[PDB]
Design a protein around this ligand. Structure first.
Ligand SMILES: *Cc1cc2c(cc1C)nc1c(=O)[nH]c(=O)nc-1n2C[C@H](O)[C@H](O)[C@H](O)COP(=O)(O)OP(=O)(O)OC[C@H]1O[C@@H](n2cnc3c(N)ncnc32)[C@H](O)[C@@H]1O
Ligand SMILES: O=C(Nc1ccccc1)Nc1ccnc(Cl)c1
Length: 444
């Protein structure tokens, strides 16, 4: 028994996202109690004369209306199952509601056996369904793969309102389709997340580089290890400097070897001498670092501003050219940069990566000036110049969280083989194009 809402506040929240640009309004907001309610609503849309749009909304972190259902219904997804041990899988898992926020997943698993997911996002106030519809990447991805490589099973409400249990061994086409599938094939109501025994503490390290060749070579060396770091990221610093960000996870057993492990790993690096900054803190506090920054930004009215964010996966063979052309060139806010290992990404998923073993996430996490539309416009022009640069020099970059829209652009994004598979999955699972229409891939 779900609740359909026309409360102006619910409609307003469902008509906006973190991007702060796209504002397509639904007719109503649906508040489900369980998966059956979501099935009932989607089934009704599938059976309706006009076939109204239905989109699941997580924490509303989309940049360009990906969770918006124009003139349709937005499903507001955001007792709990205890983590379970499996002798067959050789480890723990936990069943979570599709709308559960990663921060709540973490608190639950830690309080029920000191367990935690292996692969994260930088920000824990994201839904499980939301990140599993993209990839879910952070400093752990190089080793454990993205969050889509750390899920055993799903319950999916298809575009026909059918509840399907899927995994690698049961309805694999739907399971792999949904993973990185941009909400196109169904709403995730359950996700079975892989867990490891959680470390208690983190040795959080930052070091500076003026030489991009040295910075990238050290990042690429670090991701090839396994003695290694548990987290590998980086960011562009305005003086242009490059910051290497690494962590070493530890507990009561490994506390006696953490100092030597860190010193041995750092001694092999080429960072600028005297630029090593170190922090020692609990695991939860490190993982929740972005939420701490959010509370400060909200206090200064600098959180609820437009975010014209651009995320690219750049092949490592083209990272050098990307730099003097972009970081020195086009740019002259936070710019993330770190490499990942493609072998940790299952090629059966809908996720789109460059055709190279090592590729970088290059994240332009820009904030427009509050109440200043011209700031958003200038930042959007900068984003287009970055795409023009990639196109003009033939960098085979792929957009992460793509905001494309044109049919030939989606064809180019996926490539022929992946596009054909994606279209066949849509015909099978959402033939009326009811689901996640805000992604702008298909029409009824
Ligand atoms: C705002 C933000 C985003 C973010 C981040 C930090 C911030 C402050 N850090 C990230 C990181 O380190 N790594 C990464 O992989 N992504 C990061 N992000 C981006 C984020 O993952 C995406 O914005 C993603 O969409 C998750 O956000 P959210 O949970 O808010 O979900 P949504 O934006 O409402 O909807 C996204 C799309 O998925 C569909 N959807 C939503 N829930 C479901 C379920 N349960 N099942 C199926 N599809 C679902 C929406 O309809 C939409 O198309
Ligand atoms: O947004 C992030 N990562 C991200 C976002 C979208 C796609 C991929 C990565 N990371 C992050 C780190 C520090 N502060 C803030 Cl506000 C955000």
């Amino acid at each position: 028994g779900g609740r359909l809402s026309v409360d102006a506040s619910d409609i307003a929240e469902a008509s906006r996202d973190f991007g702060g640009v796209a504002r397509a309004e639904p007719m109503a907001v649906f508040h489900p109690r369980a998966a059956g309610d979501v099935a009932g609503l989607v089934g009704a849309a599938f059976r309706s004369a006009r076939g109204f749009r239905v989109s699941a909304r997580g924490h509303g972190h989309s940049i360009s209306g990906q969770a918006q259902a124009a003139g349709g219904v937005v499903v507001d997804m955001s007792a709990r199952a205890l983590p379970v041990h499996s002798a067959a899988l050789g480890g723990h898992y936990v069943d979570v509601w599709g709308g559960e926020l990663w921060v709540d997943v973490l608190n639950w698993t830690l309080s029920h056996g000191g367990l935690a997911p292996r692969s994260w996002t930088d920000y824990l106030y994201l839904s499980v369904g939301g990140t599993l519809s993209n990839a879910g990447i952070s400093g752990q991805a190089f080793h454990h793969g993205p969050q889509i490589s750390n899920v055993y099973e799903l319950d999916v409400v298809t575009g026909k309102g059918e509840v399907v249990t899927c995994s690698e061994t049961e309805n694999p086409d739907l399971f792999f389709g949904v993973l990185g599938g941009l909400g196109q094939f169904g709403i995730i109501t359950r996700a079975r997340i892989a867990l490891e025994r959680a470390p208690k503490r983190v040795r959080w390290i930052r070091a500076l580089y003026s030489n991009f060749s040295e910075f990238t070579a050290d990042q690429e060396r670090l991701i090839s290890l396994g003695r290694r770091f548990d987290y590998v990221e980086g960011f562009v610093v305005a003086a242009v400097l490059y910051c290497l960000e690494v962590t070493k996870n530890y507990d009561d057993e490994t506390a006696g070897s953490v100092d030597q492990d860190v010193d041995t790993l750092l001694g092999e690096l080429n960072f600028l001498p005297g630029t090593v900054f170190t922090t020692d803190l609990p695991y939860v506090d490190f993982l929740d670092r972005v939420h701490k920054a959010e509370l400060k930004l909200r206090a200064k009215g600098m959180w609820e501003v437009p975010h014209p964010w651009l995320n690219l996966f750049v092949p490592a063979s083209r990272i050098a050219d990307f730099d003097r052309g972009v970081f020195r060139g086009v740019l002259g806010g936070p710019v993330l940069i770190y490499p990942m290992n493609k072998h940790k990404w299952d090629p059966r998923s809908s996720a789109v990566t460059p055709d190279e073993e090592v590729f970088y996430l290059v994240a332009f996490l820009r904030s427009a000036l509050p109440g200043a539309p011209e700031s958003l416009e200038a930042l959007a022009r900068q984003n287009q110049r970055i795409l023009d640069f990639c196109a003009g020099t033939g960098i085979g970059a792929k957009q992460y969280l793509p905001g494309h829209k044109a049919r030939h652009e989606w064809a180019e994004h996926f490539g022929a083989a992946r596009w054909d598979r994606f279209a066949r999955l849509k015909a099978e699972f959402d033939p009326r194009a009811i689901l996640a229409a805000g992604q702008g891939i298909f029409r009824p």
